[PDB]
């Protein structure tokens, strides 16, 4: 779930923080 | 409609806020 799936809004950036290296 | 959405390949920008410097495992499937 890291593709452009987030298109219905902006997706919480903090939620994407778990993907960091 | 030019908002800060994430469709096509603009999501990398959102993931940039994640770590940015350290980078991330951007391997969108």
Curated annotation (Swiss-Prot), chain A:
Disulfide bonds: 6-11
TM segment ranges: none
Name of the protein in its database record: Insulin A chain
Swiss-Prot record, chain B:
Organism domain of life: Eukaryota
Transmembrane intervals: none
Name listed for the protein in its UniProt record: Insulin B chain
Species in which this protein is naturally found: Homo sapiens
Organism lineage: Eukaryota, Metazoa, Chordata, Craniata, Vertebrata
């Amino acid at each position: 779930g890291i593709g452009e799936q987030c298109c219905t809004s902006i997706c919480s950036l903090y939620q994407l923080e778990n993907y960091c290296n | 409609e030019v908002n800060q959405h994430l469709c096509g390949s603009e999501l990398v920008e959102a993931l940039e806020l994640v770590c940015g410097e350290r980078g991330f495992f951007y391997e969108p499937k």
